[PDB]
Paper text:
Like Plks, [name] contains a Ser/Thr kinase domain followed by a polo-box domain that mediates substrate recognition and sub-cellular localization. The polo-box domain is made up of two polo boxes that together define the p(S/T)-binding pocket. [name] promotes the release of Cdc14 from the nucleolus and regulates the mitotic exit network (MEN)9,16–18 as well as cytokinesis. Here we demonstrate that the polo-box domain of [name] uses distinct surfaces to bind phosphorylated and non-phosphorylated substrates.
Instead, it uses a unique polo-interacting motif (83RSIEGA88) to interact with the polo-box domain of Cdc527. To elucidate how [name] interacts with [name], we next solved the structure of the polo-box domain in the presence of a [name]-derived peptide (76RARIERARSIEGAVQVSKGTG96). Crystals of this complex diffracted X-rays to lower resolution (~3.5 Å), but the structure could be readily determined by molecular replacement using the polo-box domain of the [name]-Spc72P structure The polo-box domain was virtually identical to the other two structures (r.m.s. deviations of 0.86 and 0.66 Å with the apo- and Spc72P-bound structures, respectively). As expected, the pS/T-binding pocket was not occupied by [name]. After a cycle of refinement, the surface opposite to the pS/T-binding pocket showed significant peaks (>2.5σ) on the Fo-Fc electron density maps. While these additional electron densities lacked connectivity and could not account for the entire [name] peptide, they could accommodate few amino acids. Intriguingly, these electron density peaks were close to the hydrophobic pocket defined by residues Leu546, Trp555, Ile557 and Ala567 from [name] and coincided with the position that Phe603 occupies in the structure of the polo-box domain of [name] on its own. To test whether this surface of the polo-box domain was important for the interaction with [name], we introduced a A567W mutation on the polo-box domain to occlude the hydrophobic pocket. Conversely, the [name] peptide failed to interact with the A567W variant of the polo-box domain, indicating that the integrity of the hydrophobic surface of the polo-box domain of [name] opposite to the pS/T-binding pocket is important for [name]-peptide binding. Superimposition of the polo-box domain of [name] onto that of zPlk1 reveals that the [name]-binding surface overlaps with the surface where the kinase domain binds.
Numbering used by the authors:
A (entry chain A): 451 to 597, 609 to 705
B (entry chain C): 83 to 90
The structure:
């Protein structure tokens, strides 16, 4: 009998706050999906005969390149794999700068339908919004330092100690761990995009990595551990159906 | 061009 124990509970901090329960309900029902898509994959390695026959899809999902937290003068901010910049204000609203930068989406959150957006141009921009772009204009200057399809944005984040969790609008979950190993789940818990500290993206079917016993190529990853951290990560995030 | 993962 293997003498082992469950990992300590996942304590979180500085999550972006939201009122729209239904939005939480979607995330909760969405997290559980990619989690069930993984349990279904772990079952493919365990006792799946010829688990690699009918090929699985292959596509590089979106991801977060550089990110920051801020408390007072500005809100949490981030940048994506499309040279896009987002700003999750302290109130909960988001402003997103597109790749080609002629335009920008302004996202709010509502209880009835959930997240809701509206298209504007920087040139045909309104008044009350301009002061929100002053904030973005600074993150643009900061982010600028550096040492189509249906677009995407960040819904919720959660700062745990061992890592930080990103929940995206396209159904893609991302994790920047402590040891700078960064990973991502997309396609409903079927594809794996490990991006080492060396910013190199490569996607893999989950059933292919499970048989291997580790991340492909990189042995210093300690993969079998991080997977466990993802699971309980989604488990906790999937129980949040309400605000209380 | 509509944004996936939210309502317009």
């Amino acid at each position: 009998a293997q003498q082992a124990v469950l990992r300590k509970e996942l304590i979180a901090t500085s999550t972006n706050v939201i009122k729209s329960e239904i939005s939480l309900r979607i995330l909760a029902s969405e997290c559980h999906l990619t989690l069930n898509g993984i349990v279904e994959a772990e079952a493919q390695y365990k006792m799946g005969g010829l688990p690699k026959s009918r090929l699985p899809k292959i596509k590089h999902p979106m991801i977060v390149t550089k990110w920051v937290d801020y408390s007072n003068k500005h809100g949490f901010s981030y940048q994506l794999s499309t040279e896009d910049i987002g700003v999750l204000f302290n109130n909960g609203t988001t402003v997103l700068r597109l790749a080609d930068a002629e335009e920008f989406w302004y996202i709010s959150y509502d209880d009835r339908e959930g997240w809701v957006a509206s298209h504007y141009l920087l040139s045909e921009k309104p008044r009350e919004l301009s002061r929100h772009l002053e904030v973005v204009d600074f993150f643009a200057k900061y982010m600028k330092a550096n040492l189509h399809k249906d677009d995407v944005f960040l819904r919720r984040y959660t700062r745990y100690k061992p890592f930080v969790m990103f929940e995206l609008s396209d159904g893609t979950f991302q994790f920047n761990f402590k040891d700078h190993h960064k990973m991502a789940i997309s396609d409903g818990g079927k594809l794996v995009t490990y991006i080492s500290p060396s910013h190199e993206s490569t996607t893999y079917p989950l059933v292919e990595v499970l048989k291997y016993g580790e991340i492909p190529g990189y042995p210093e990853s300690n993969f079998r551990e991080k997977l466990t951290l993802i699971k309980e990560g989604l488990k906790q995030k999937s129980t949040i159906v309400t605000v209380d | 061009r509509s944004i996936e993962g939210a309502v317009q």
